[PDB]
Design a protein around this ligand. Structure first.
Ligand code: JXX
Ligand code: MG
Ligand code: ZN
Length: 315
């Protein structure tokens, strides 16, 4: 257990910042994740051999889609790492173990299509799971991989710690369903403002962990503008494919997803920062003040999209 992962100096320092980009070298992403587990959790949280086999099985079960890919998995885990590191004493040992694994697993076997597209297609997964269709699948895929031989990174936990962590992971992965985000944040807003928010109340923690999951999941909008902008193209490449597939089912897609209406992208990103991103990091910053850099970066990027619209730069 005397075997640290270390990172080159520039990464060793930048990985601690919310806005860290994990880079274009895929073969370093596993080592970045282990590094984060070792500092966030301990070098003892997981048997390294089991962790490495688990990481590589998770990687293998992410597909080669423009956005909802292995890089998104590690990026979202890194944002959670930064939240946990900036809020040291607020989370249990089980929560630190669970949430980085939840983040790495949260989009397992994603095909680049929304819950909506599965329902209009009449995909079998839409029959098996009527709401949070892809997210119940992602959790399903996580449990499958935990059950491959040699892959039970939790095997040293007690029976009841095992149940607690898998339950943290399931809520955390379900919370990445943006349809559940709006009510979750509204509730957290009221509880914070009326002063009823209580982190010893498990159902309140669940809510707070769900909003962190949304914050980590959307964290593309909290990068430096050049990362945010280039990622938006991957995001839109999936939307346009979905739009195409909607048109093949005989359904005019929403204009966000229509590759004939690319002109409307900047105004669509404005709606998204205003309806989703800014509210998310605002309430998150209210509950966890050290996460403010996420809100500040998100505001900077809103202002960068306003500049794209005012023709003061292009896409
Ligand atoms: Cl319009 C839009 N949707 C996003 N997400 C909604 C659907 O799940 C996938 C991602 C998004 C996520 C991050 C950054 C900008 C984004 N912009
Ligand atoms: Mg998802
Ligand atoms: Zn995601």
């Amino acid at each position: 257990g005397l075997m640290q992962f270390t990172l080159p100096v520039r990464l060793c320092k930048e990985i601690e910042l919310f806005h860290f980009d994990i880079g274009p070298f895929e073969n370093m992403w596993p080592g970045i994740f282990v590094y984060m587990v070792h500092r966030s959790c301990g070098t003892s949280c997981f048997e390294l051999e089991k962790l490495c086999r688990f990481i590589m099985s998770v990687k293998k079960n992410y597909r080669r889609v423009p956005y909802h890919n292995w890089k998104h998995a590690v990026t979202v885990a890194h944002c959670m790492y930064a939240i946990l590191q900036n809020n040291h004493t607020l989370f249990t040992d089980l929560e630190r173990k669970g949430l980085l694994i939840a983040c790495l697993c949260h989009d397992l076997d994603h095909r680049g299509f929304s819950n909506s597209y599965l329902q209009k297609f009449d995909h079998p997964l839409a029959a098996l799971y009527s709401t949070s269709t892809m997210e119940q699948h992602h959790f399903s895929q996580t449990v499958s991989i935990l059950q491959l031989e040699g892959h039970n990174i939790f095997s040293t936990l007690s029976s009841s710690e095992y149940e607690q962590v898998l339950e943290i992971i399931r809520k955390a992965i379900i919370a990445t369903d943006l349809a559940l985000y709006f009510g979750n944040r509204k509730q957290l807003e009221e509880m914070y403002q009326t002063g009823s928010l209580n982190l010893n109340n498990q159902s309140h923690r669940d809510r707070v962990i769900g909003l962190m999951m949304t914050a980590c999941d959307l964290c593309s909008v909290t990068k430096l503008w050049p990362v945010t902008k280039l990622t938006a193209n991957d995001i839109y490449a999936e939307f346009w494919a979905e739009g195409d597939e909607m048109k093949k089912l005989g359904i005019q897609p929403i204009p966000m997803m229509d590759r004939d209406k690319k002109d409307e992208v900047p105004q669509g990103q404005l709606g998204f920062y205003n309806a989703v991103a800014i509210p998310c990091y605002t309430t998150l910053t209210q509950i966890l003040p050290p996460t403010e850099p996420l809100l500040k970066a998100c505001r900077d990027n809103l202002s960068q999209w306003e500049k794209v619209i005012r023709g003061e730069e292009t896409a």
